[PDB]
Tab-separated table of C-alpha atoms and ligand atoms in Angstrom:
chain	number	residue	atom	x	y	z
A	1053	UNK	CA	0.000	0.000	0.000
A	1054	UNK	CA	3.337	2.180	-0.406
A	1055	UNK	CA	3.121	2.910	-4.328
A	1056	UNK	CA	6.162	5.381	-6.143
A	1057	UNK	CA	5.171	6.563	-9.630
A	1058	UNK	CA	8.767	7.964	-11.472
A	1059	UNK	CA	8.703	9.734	-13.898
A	1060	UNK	CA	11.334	12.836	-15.452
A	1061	UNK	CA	8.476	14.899	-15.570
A	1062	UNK	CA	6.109	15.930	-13.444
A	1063	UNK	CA	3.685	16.871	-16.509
A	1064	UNK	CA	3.527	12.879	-16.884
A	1065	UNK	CA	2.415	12.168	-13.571
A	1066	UNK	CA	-0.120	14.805	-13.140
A	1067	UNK	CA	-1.338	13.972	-17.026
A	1068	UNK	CA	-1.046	10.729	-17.566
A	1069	UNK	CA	-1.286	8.821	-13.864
A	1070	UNK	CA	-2.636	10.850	-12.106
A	1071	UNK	CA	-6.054	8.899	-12.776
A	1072	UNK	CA	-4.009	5.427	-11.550
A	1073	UNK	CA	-2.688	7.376	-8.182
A	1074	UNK	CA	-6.011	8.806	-7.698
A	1075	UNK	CA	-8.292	5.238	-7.496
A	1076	UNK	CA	-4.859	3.795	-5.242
A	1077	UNK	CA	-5.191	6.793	-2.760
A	1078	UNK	CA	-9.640	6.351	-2.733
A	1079	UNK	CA	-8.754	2.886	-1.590
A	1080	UNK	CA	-6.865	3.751	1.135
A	1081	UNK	CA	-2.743	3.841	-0.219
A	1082	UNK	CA	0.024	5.974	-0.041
A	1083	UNK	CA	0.635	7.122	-3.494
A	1084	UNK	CA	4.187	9.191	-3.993
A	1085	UNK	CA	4.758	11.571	-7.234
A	1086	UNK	CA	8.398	11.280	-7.870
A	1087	UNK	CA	9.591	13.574	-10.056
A	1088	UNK	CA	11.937	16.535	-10.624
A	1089	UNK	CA	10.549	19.946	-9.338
A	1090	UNK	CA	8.151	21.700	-12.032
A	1091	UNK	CA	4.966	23.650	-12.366
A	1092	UNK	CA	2.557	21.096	-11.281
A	1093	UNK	CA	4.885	20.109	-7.926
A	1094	UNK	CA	2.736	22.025	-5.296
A	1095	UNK	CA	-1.121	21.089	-6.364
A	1096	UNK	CA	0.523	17.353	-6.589
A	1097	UNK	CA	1.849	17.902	-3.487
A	1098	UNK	CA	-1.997	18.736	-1.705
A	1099	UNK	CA	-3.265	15.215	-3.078
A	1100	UNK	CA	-0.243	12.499	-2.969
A	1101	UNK	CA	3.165	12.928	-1.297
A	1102	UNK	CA	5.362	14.700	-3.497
A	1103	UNK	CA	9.550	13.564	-3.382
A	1104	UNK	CA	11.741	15.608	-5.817
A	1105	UNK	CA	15.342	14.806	-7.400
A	1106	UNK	CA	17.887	16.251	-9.319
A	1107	UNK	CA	17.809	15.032	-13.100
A	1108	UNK	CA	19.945	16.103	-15.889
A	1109	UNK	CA	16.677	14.669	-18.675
A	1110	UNK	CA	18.392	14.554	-21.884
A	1111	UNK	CA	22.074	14.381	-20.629
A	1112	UNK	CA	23.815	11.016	-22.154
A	1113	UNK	CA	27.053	11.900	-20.207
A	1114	UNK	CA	27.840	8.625	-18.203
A	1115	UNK	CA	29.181	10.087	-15.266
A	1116	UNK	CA	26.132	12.471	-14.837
A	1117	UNK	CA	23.762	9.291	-15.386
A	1118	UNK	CA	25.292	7.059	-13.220
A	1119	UNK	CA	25.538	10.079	-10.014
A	1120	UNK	CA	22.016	11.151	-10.976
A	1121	UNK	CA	20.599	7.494	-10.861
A	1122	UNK	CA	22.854	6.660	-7.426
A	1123	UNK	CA	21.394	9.271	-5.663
A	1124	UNK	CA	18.170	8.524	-6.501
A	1125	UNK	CA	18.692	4.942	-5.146
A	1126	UNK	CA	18.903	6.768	-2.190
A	1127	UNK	CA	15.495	9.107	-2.733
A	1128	UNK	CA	13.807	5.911	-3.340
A	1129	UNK	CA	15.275	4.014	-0.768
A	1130	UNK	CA	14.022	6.485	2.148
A	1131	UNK	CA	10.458	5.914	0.930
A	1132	UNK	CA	10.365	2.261	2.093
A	1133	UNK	CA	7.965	1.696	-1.521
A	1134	UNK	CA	5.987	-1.417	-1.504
A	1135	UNK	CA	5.514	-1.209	-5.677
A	1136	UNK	CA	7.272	1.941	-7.927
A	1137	UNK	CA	5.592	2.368	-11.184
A	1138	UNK	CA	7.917	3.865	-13.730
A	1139	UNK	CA	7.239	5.435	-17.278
A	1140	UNK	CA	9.236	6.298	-20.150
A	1141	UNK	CA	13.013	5.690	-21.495
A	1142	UNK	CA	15.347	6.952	-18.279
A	1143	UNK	CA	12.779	6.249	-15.102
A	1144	UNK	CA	12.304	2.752	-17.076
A	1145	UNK	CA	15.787	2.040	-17.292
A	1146	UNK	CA	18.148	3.794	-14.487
A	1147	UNK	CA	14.544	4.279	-12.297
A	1148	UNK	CA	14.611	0.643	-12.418
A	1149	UNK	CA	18.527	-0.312	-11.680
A	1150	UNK	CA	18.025	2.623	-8.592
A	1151	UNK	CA	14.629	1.136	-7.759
A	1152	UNK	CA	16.183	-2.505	-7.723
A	1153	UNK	CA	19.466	-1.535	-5.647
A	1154	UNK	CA	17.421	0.506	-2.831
A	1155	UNK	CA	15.762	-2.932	-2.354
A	1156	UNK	CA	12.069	-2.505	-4.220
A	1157	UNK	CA	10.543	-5.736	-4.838
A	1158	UNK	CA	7.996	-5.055	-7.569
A	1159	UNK	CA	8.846	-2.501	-10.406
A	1160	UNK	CA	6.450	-2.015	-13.302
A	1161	UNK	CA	7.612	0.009	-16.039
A	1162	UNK	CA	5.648	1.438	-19.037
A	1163	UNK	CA	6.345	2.535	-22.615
A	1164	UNK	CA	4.405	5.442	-24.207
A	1165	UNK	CA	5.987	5.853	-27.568
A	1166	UNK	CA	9.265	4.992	-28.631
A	1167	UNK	CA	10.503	8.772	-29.130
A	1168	UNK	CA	13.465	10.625	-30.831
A	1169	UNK	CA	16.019	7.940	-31.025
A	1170	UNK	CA	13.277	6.344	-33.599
A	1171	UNK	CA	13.081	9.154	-35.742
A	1172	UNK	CA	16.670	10.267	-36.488
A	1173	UNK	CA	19.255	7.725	-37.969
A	1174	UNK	CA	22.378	9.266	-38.048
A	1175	UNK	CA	25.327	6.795	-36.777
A	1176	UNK	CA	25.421	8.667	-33.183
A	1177	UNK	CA	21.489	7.417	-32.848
A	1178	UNK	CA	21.255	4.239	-34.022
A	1179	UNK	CA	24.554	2.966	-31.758
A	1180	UNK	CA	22.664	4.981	-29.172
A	1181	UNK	CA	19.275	3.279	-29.953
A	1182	UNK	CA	21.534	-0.239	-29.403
A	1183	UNK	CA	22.496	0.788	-25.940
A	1184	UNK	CA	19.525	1.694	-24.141
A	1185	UNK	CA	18.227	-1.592	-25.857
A	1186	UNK	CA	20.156	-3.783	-24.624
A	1187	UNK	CA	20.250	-1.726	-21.616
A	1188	UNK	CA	15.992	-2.581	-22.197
A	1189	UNK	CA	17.140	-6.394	-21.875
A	1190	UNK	CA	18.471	-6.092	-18.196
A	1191	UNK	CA	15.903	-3.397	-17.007
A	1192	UNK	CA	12.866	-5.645	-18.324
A	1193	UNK	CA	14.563	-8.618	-16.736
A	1194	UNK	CA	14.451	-7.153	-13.447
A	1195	UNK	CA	11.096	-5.357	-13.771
A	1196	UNK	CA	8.229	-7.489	-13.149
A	1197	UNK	CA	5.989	-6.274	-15.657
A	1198	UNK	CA	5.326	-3.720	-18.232
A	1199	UNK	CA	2.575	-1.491	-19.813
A	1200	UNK	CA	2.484	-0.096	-23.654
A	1201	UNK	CA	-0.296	2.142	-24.375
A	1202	UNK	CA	-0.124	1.273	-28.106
A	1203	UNK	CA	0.528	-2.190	-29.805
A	1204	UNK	CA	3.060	-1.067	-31.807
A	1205	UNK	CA	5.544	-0.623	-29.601
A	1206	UNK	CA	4.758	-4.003	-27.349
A	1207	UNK	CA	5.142	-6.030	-30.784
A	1208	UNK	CA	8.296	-3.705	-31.690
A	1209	UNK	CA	10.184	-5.060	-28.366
A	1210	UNK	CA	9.228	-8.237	-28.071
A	1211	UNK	CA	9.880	-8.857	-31.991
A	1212	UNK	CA	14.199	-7.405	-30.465
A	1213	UNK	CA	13.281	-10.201	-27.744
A	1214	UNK	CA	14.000	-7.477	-25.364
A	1215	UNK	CA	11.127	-8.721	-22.724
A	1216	UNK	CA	8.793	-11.815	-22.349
A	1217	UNK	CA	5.428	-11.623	-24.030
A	1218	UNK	CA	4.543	-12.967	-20.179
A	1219	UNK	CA	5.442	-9.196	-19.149
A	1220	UNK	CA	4.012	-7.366	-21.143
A	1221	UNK	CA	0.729	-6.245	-20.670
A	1222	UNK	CA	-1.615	-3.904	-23.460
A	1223	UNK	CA	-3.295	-0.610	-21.783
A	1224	UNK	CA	-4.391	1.356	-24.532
A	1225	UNK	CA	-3.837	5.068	-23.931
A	1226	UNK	CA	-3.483	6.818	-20.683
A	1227	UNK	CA	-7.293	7.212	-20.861
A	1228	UNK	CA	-9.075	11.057	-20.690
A	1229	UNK	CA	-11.646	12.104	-17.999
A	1230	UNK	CA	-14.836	11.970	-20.640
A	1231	UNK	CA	-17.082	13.742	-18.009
A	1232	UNK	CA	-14.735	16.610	-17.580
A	1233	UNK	CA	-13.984	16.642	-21.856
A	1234	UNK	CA	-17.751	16.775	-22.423
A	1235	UNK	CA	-18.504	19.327	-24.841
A	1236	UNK	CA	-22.270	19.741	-23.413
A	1237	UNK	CA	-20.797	21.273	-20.054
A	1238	UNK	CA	-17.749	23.167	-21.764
A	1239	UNK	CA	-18.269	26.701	-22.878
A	1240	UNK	CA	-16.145	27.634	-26.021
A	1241	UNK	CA	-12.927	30.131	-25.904
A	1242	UNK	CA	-13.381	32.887	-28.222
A	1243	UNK	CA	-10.996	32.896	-30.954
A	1244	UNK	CA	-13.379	34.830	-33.214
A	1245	UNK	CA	-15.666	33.803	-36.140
A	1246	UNK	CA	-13.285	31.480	-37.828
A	1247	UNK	CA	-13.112	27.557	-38.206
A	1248	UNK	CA	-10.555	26.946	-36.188
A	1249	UNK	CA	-7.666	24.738	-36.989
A	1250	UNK	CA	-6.536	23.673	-33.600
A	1251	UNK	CA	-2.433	21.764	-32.674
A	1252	UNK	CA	-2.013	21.208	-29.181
A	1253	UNK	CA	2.017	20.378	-28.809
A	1254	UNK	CA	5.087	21.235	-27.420
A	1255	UNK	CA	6.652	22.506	-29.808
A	1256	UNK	CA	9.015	19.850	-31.057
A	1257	UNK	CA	9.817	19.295	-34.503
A	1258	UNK	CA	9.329	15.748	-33.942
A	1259	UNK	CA	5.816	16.948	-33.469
A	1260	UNK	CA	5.374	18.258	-36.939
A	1261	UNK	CA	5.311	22.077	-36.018
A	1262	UNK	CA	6.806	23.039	-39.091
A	1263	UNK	CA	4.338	21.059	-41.386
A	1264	UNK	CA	1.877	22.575	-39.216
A	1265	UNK	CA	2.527	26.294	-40.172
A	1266	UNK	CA	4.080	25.330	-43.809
A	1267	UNK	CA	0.307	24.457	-44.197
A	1268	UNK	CA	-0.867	27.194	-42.369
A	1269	UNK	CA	1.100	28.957	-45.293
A	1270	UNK	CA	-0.438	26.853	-48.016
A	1271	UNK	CA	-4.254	27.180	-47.645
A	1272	UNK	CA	-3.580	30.512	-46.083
A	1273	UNK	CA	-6.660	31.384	-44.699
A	1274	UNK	CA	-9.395	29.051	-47.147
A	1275	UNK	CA	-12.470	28.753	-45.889
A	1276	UNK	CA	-12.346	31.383	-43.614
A	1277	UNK	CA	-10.205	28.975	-41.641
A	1278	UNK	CA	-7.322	29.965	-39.107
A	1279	UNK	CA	-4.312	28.189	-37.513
A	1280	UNK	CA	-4.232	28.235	-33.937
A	1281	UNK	CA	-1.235	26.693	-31.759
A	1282	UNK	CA	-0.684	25.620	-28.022
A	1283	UNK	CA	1.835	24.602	-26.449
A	1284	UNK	CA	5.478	26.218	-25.289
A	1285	UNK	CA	8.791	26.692	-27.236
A	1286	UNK	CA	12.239	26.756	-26.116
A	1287	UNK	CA	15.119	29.095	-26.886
A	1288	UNK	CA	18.767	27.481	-27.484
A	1289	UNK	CA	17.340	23.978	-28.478
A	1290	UNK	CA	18.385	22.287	-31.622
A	1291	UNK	CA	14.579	19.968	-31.176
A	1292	UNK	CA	12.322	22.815	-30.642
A	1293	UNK	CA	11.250	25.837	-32.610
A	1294	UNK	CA	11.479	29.472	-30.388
A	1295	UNK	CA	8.537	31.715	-29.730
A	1296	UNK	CA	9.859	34.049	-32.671
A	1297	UNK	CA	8.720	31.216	-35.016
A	1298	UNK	CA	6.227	30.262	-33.291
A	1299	UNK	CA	4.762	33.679	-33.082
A	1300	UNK	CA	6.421	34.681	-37.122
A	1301	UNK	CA	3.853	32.398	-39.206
A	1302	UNK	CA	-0.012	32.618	-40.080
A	1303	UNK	CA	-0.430	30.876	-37.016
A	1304	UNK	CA	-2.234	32.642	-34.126
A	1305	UNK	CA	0.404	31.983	-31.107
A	1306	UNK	CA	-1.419	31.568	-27.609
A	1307	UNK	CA	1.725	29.808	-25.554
A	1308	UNK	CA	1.146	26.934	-22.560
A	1309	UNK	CA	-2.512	27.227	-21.401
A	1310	UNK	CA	-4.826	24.783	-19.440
A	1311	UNK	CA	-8.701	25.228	-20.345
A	1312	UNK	CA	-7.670	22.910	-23.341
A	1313	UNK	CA	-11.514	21.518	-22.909
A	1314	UNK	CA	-12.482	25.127	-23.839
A	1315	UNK	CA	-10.156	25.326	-26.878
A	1316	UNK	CA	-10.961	22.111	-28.505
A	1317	UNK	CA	-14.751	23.157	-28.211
A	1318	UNK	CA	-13.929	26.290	-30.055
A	1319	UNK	CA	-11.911	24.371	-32.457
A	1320	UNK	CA	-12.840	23.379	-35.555
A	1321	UNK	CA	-10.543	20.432	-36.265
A	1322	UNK	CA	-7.261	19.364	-34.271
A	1323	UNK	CA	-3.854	18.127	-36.075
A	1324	UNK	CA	-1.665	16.235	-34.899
A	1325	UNK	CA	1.423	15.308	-37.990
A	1326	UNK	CA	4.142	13.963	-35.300
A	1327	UNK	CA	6.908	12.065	-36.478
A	1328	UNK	CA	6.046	9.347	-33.775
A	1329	UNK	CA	3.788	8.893	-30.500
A	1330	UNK	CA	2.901	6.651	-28.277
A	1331	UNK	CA	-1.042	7.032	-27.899
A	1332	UNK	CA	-1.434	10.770	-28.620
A	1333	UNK	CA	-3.658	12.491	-25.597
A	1334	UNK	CA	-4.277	15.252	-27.769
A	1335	UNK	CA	-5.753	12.995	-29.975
A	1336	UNK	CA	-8.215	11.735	-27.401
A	1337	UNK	CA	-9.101	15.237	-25.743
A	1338	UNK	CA	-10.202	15.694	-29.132
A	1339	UNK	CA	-12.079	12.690	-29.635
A	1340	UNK	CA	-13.984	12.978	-26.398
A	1341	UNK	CA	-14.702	16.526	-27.623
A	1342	UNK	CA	-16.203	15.065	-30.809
A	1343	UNK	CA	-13.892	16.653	-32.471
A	1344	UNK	CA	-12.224	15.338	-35.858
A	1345	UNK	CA	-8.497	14.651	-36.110
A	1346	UNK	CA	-6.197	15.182	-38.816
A	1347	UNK	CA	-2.899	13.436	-38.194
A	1348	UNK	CA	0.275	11.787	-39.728
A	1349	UNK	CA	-0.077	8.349	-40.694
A	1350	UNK	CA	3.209	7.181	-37.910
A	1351	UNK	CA	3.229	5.225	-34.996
A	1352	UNK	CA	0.491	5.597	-32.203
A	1353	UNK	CA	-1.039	8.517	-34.738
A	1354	UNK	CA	-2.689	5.033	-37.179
A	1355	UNK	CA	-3.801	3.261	-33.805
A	1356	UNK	CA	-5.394	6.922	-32.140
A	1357	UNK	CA	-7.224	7.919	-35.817
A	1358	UNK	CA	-8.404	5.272	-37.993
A	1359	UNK	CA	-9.266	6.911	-41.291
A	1360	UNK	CA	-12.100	7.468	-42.404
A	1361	UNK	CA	-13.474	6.354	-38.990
A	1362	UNK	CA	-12.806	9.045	-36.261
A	1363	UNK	CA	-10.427	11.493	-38.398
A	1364	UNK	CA	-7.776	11.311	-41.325
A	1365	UNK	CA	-4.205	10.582	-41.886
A	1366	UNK	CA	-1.947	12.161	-43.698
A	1367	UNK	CA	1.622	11.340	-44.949
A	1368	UNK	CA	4.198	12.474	-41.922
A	1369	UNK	CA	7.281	15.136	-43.460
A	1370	UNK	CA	4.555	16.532	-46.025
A	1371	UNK	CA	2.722	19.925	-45.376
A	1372	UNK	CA	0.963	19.315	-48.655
A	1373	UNK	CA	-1.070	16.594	-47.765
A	1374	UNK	CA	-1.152	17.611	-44.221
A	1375	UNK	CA	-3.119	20.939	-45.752
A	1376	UNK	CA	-4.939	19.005	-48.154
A	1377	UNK	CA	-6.403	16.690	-45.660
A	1378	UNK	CA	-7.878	20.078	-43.717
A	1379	UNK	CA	-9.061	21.396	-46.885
A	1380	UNK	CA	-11.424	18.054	-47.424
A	1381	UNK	CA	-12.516	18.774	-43.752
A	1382	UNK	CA	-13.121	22.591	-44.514
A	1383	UNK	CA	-14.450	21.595	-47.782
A	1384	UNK	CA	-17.013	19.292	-46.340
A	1385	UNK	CA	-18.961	19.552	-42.847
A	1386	UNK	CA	-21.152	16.707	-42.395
A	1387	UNK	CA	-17.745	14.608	-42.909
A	1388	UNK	CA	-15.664	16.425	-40.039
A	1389	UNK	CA	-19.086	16.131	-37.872
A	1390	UNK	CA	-19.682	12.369	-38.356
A	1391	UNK	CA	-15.437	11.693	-38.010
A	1392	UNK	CA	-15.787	13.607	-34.661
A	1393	UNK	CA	-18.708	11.900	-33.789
A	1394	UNK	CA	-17.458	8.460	-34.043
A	1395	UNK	CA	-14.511	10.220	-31.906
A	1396	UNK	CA	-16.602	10.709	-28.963
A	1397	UNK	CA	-18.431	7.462	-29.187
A	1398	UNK	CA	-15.178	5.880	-29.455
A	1399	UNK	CA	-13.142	7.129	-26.239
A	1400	UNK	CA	-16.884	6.967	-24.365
A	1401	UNK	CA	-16.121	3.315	-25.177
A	1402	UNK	CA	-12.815	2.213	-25.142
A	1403	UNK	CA	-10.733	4.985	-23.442
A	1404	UNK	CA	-11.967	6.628	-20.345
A	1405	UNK	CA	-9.204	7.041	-17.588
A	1406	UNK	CA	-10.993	5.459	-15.119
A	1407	UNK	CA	-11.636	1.785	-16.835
A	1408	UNK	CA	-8.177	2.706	-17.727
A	1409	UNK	CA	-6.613	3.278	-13.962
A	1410	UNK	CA	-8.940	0.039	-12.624
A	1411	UNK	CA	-6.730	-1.940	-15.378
A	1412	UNK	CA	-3.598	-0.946	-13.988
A	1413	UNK	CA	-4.513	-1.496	-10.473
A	1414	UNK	CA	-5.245	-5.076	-11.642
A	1415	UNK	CA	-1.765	-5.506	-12.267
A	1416	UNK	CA	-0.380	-4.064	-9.216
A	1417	UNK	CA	-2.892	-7.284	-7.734
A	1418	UNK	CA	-0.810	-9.660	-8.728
A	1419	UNK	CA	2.082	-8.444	-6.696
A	1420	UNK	CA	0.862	-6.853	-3.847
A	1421	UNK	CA	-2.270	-6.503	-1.630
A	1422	UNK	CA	-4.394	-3.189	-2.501
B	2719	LIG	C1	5.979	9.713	-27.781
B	2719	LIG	C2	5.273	11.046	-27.900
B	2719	LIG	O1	5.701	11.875	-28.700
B	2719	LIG	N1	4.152	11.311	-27.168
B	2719	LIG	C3	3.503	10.452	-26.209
B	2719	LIG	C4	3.892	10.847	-24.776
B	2719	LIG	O2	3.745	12.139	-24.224
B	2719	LIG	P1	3.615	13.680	-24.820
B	2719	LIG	O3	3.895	14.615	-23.698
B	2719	LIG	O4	4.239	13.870	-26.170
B	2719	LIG	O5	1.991	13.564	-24.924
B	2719	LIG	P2	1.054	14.729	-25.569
B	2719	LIG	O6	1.843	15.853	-26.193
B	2719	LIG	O7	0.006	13.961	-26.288
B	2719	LIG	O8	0.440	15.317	-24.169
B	2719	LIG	C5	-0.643	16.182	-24.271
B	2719	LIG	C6	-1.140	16.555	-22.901
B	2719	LIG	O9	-0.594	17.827	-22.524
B	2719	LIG	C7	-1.619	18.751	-22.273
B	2719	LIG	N2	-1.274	20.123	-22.664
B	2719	LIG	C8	-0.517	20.361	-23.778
B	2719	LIG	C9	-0.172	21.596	-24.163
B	2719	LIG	C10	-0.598	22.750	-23.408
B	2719	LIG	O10	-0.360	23.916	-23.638
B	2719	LIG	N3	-1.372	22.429	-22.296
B	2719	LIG	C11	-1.737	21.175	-21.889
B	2719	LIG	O11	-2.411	21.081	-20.902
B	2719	LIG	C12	-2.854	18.210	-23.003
B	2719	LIG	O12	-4.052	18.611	-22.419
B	2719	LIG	C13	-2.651	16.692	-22.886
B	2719	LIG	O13	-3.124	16.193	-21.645
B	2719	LIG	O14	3.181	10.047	-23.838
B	2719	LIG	C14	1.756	10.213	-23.866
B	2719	LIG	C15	1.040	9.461	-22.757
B	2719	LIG	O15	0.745	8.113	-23.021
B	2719	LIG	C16	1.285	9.772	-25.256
B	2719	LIG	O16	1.577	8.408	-25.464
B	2719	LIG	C17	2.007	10.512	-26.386
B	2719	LIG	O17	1.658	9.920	-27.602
């Protein structure tokens, strides 16, 4: 009844399981965020027991991963965890040789997409790719289990016979609170008179941002149409694109926000054309806001938007097609309706976070007592 959830971020916990901690602390557990300090750290804080760390995220420097990872066997340690749930690459790997070494019986990890070292393919990545692989084969070995929110991925490893088809257990998506995405109770941000055309991102390239306002530039304005974006830049990094481009385009720039349930129901249509996901929540907030999705035709993107079904897909790299699937949208209501429609009957269905969290708990069952 001690349960850790690691992450690098606290955006993942208080996204993505925070529904999971939430049904473990109604029943009576201690539920810890563990997570580097952020913007979400104090309100996390009021609801489970928040422990911080020190975490250099992207650094590959071996000496900084191995110190960072020590003294987090120590963080970890102090916590006297019955279970630690981890998620994504570094709190799957090194959260799991630091959860293992402070003496944690059960570790379950999780994969959400597969990310950058997927995408690029220069000589540097794919040796890199190699390592944390067959880093994967240890890690796995001593974890007990693990989730994938897509299939994808779970075939992808086990094909590398990285982990035990035994282990691996199929969670699609992190799940969305339908009742709180419900576009009866939501009242619509005011973006003006326009059908909007709606990314929600960080603003990666791997997330297609410059597809995004190269079509912005193409249909330039069709249909009375207009590109919105949110999400934040960075300045001084190589994978993200700074407010001066994000703010430079004929995209309407409106930063980090948080009544996203108010800007899909203003939106017209929401893209998505990443490189590579996992199971895209934006994608889902969408769908439960019966709202259609236009989105590259990549990993987690193809298993989030069936086409023709609940949105289209587009070809990934290609601001063409990317525009000329919101053209058939803005060329054709009833279509974008019905697509969006399906959307909502679909999460309703399949992908609300709390069917979603009672699935995880399930696993923690087999391991210890809740
Ligand atoms: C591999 C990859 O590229 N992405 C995956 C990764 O996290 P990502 O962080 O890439 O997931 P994402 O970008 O889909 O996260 C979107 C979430 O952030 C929220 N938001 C975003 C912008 C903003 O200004 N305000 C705001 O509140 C939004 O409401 C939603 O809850 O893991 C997720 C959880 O399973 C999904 O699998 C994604 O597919």
């Amino acid at each position: 009844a001690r349960i850790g959830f690691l992450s690098h971020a606290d955006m993942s916990i208080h996204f993505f399981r925070r529904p999971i901690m939430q049904a473990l602390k109604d029943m009576g557990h201690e539920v810890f965020a563990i997570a580097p300090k952020g913007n979400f750290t104090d309100e996390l804080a009021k609801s489970f027991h928040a422990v911080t760390y020190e975490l250099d995220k992207a650094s590959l420097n071996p000496l900084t991963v191995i110190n960072n990872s020590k003294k987090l066997s120590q963080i970890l340690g102090e916590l006297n965890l019955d279970l630690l749930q981890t998620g994504a690459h570094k709190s799957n790997v090194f959260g799991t040789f630091a959860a293992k070494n402070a003496g944690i019986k059960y570790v379950i990890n999780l994969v959400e997409g597969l990310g950058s070292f997927y995408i690029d393919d220069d000589i540097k990545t794919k040796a890199v790719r190699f390592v944390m692989e067959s880093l994967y084969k240890i890690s796995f070995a001593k974890a007990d289990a693990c989730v994938f929110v897509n299939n994808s991925d779970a075939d992808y490893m086990i094909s590398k016979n990285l982990i035990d088809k035994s282990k691996v257990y199929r969670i699609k998506s992190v799940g969305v609170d339908t009742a709180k995405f419900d576009p009866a109770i939501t009242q619509a941000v005011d973006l003006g008179e326009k059908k909007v055309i709606l990314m929600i991102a960080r603003a990666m390239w791997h997330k297609g941002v410059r597809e995004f306002y190269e079509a912005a530039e193409i249909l330039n304005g069709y249909k009375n149409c207009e590109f919105v974006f949110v999400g934040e830049g960075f300045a001084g990094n190589k994978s993200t694109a700074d407010e001066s481009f994000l703010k430079g385009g004929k995209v309407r720039y409106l930063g980090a926000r948080n009544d996203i349930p108010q800007l899909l129901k203003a939106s017209y249509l929401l893209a998505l054309p990443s490189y590579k996901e996992g199971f895209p929540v934006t994608v889902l907030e969408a769908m439960s806001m019966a709202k259609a999705v236009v989105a590259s035709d990549v990993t987690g993107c193809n298993e989030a938007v069936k086409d023709g079904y609940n949105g289209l897909l587009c070809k990934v790299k290609d601001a063409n097609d990317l525009a000329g699937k919101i053209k058939i949208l803005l060329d054709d209501e009833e279509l974008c309706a019905r697509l969006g429609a399906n959307g909502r009957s679909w999460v309703v269905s399949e992908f609300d976070e709390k069917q979603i969290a009672k699935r995880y708990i399930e696993i923690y069952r087999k391991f210890i007592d809740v």
